[PDB]
Amino acid sequence: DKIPDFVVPGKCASVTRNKLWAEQTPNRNMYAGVWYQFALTNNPYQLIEKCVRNEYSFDGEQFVITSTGIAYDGNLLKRNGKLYPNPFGEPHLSIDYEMSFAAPLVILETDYSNYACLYSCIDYNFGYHSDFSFIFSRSANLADKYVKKCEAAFKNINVDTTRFVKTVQGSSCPYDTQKTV
C-alpha cells in the first residue's frame, strides 16, 4: 500500500469524548456563526476547494449549516449540512452533508471566539481506520497562538500534523457574494 495517507493502522484513537461533550454542551450556542476552514487533512469528500466559509445556525439542540466557496472547477458552490447529536446516544455529533454521508465529528478543542479543532474517525474491519481533521477559524487567518493549540491537540491523539493542507482564504475570496449563496 503506497496510498492513502488517510488510512491509518490501529483503531480510532481515544479522545475522552464524554469530557469534551460535558464541557462543550453548555456553550454549544457560541459555536454558532461563521467559521472559515483554515486547514484540513486530506479529504475525498470535500467539494469546496477554496474560500471555505461555514455558516452555522443553532436551534437549541442541533445545527444547520450553509457551506460556501469556490469548487474545484473554479465556480461558486453551496453545500447544505447538519450537525446534531449521535442518533444512538454516543457522546459525539454527526456531521451530515447533501450528496454525502454522516460521519462522527468531535470537537477536540475550541475557544468559540477564535478557533476550533475538529476530528472525524471511522474504523474498518481489518484493524485500520481513516480520519479527517480540520482547523476552523473565526477569521480568514488564524494566529500562531491558535494554530499551536490545534497542533498540540492533534499531536495528542497522534494525528500526523504534517498531513494538514492550508486552505485558500483572504481578500481574493468573494465572501460578500458567498453570503447571498
User: Is the Cβ of residue 138 or residue 168 nearer to a second copy in the bound state?
Assistant: 168
**Sole binder of a second copy in the list 21, 24, 104, 173 (CB under 8 A):** 104
Contact between 132 and Na ion (CB under 5 A)? yes
Chosen from Na ion, a second copy, none, partner binding at 34 (C-beta under 5 to 8 Å by type)? Na ion
Contact between 80 and a second copy (CB under 8 A)? yes
Report which of 166, 172, 126, 124 is spatially closest to residue 147, judged by C-alpha positions.
166
Quick one: which segment of 32-40, 87-95, 143-151, 164-172 binds a second copy (CB under 8 A)?
87-95
Cα separation, 26 vs 28, in Å, equals 6
Grid cell digits, residue 83: 450537525
What is the DSSP-derived secondary structure letter of residue 155?
H
Q: Which of residues 110-149 bind a second copy (CB under 8 A)?
A: 122-126, 128
Cα separation, 137 vs 114, in Å, equals 6
Contact between 34 and Na ion (CB under 5 A)? yes
Neighbours of 4 (CB within 10 A): 10
Contact between 138 and Na ion (CB under 5 A)? yes
Q: Is 159 exposed, middle or buried (0-12, 13-18, 19+ CB in 10 A)?
A: buried
Contact between 175 and Na ion (CB under 5 A)? no
Task: List contacts with Na ion (CB under 5 A).
Answer: 6, 34, 41-42, 58, 132, 138
